[PDB]
Design a protein around this ligand. Structure first.
Ligand SMILES: *[C@](O)(C(=O)NC1CC1)[C@H](CCC)NC(=O)[C@@H]1[C@H]2CCC[C@H]2CN1C(=O)[C@@H](NC(=O)[C@@H](NC(=O)c1cnccn1)C1CCCCC1)C(C)(C)C
Ligand SMILES: [Zn+2]
Length: 202
């Protein structure tokens, strides 16, 4: 048995900022501080204005990214689990949940902008990090790419859920993991956008 009246619920994912890609300069903006984030995770009620394609999101313990593509805000299952997302009307249930693809999605928040899936086939990609770095990545397979300049894995911590973009700024994938050797990220693993598209098709 167990005492049911004291069973807690997991909080909602909370949008706490965005990676601004609108101008000629990429930069992170914070829209909610830590105390606000904790409260909003509990209530699931977030009245803040949302803008942009890449959101900075937080659970109780971690901060990472979520990316809007085709009207859905996507992130990684290993980060978000089955959590609701906070919104002006209260918690919003996931529209997509797929542990096998490591993928979740919610209806894109009002005010957000969506990326469109890449159709050009380019293997020259750009990873947008949680600190608003735009890192060149050569595509190496369906779900892998190599960093042109390897980095300590710390550099990529917090970027799970962010986008890989083609040269024209279309979505190629969702970053999920670094391939590391002795703490150095030489490559990345991502969820291909075609996998999101199939998820949306049925
Ligand atoms: C992302 O969730 C994030 O930003 N998290 C911060 C806390 C909010 C995070 C980005 C890390 C740079 N992703 C991960 O932590 C992923 C997820 C995916 C499911 C489990 C975890 C582990 N992970 C990783 O990126 C790891 N990488 C790996 O496990 C790779 N393996 C190795 O690097 C390796 C394996 N054997 C020997 C030597 N090295 C595998 C490789 C195959 C594809 C999947 C990733 C770490 C070690 C955390 C970088
Ligand atoms: Zn493209």
């Amino acid at each position: 048995g167990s005492h049911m009246a004291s069973m807690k619920k997991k909080g909602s994912v909370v949008i706490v900022g965005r990676i601004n890609l609108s101008g000629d300069t990429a930069y992170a903006q914070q829209t909610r501080g830590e105390e606000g984030c904790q409260e909003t995770s509990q209530t699931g009620r977030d009245k803040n204005q949302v803008e942009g394609e890449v959101q900075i999101v937080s659970t109780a313990t971690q901060t990472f990214l979520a990316t809007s593509i085709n009207g859905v805000l996507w992130t990684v299952y290993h980060g978000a689990g089955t959590r609701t997302i906070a919104s002006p009307k209260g918690p919003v249930t996931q529209m997509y949940t797929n542990v096998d693809k490591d993928l979740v999605g919610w209806q894109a928040p009002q005010g957000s902008r969506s990326l469109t899936p890449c159709t050009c086939g380019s293997s020259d990609l750009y990873l947008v990090t949680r600190h608003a770095d735009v890192i060149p990545v050569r595509r190496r397979g369906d779900s892998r790419g190599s960093l042109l300049s390897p980095r300590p894995i710390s550099y990529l911590k917090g970027s799970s859920g962010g986008p890989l973009l083609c040269p024209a700024g279309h979505a190629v994938g969702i970053f999920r993991a670094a391939v590391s050797t002795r703490g150095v990220a030489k490559a990345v693993d991502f969820i291909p956008v075609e996998s999101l598209e199939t998820t949306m098709r049925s």
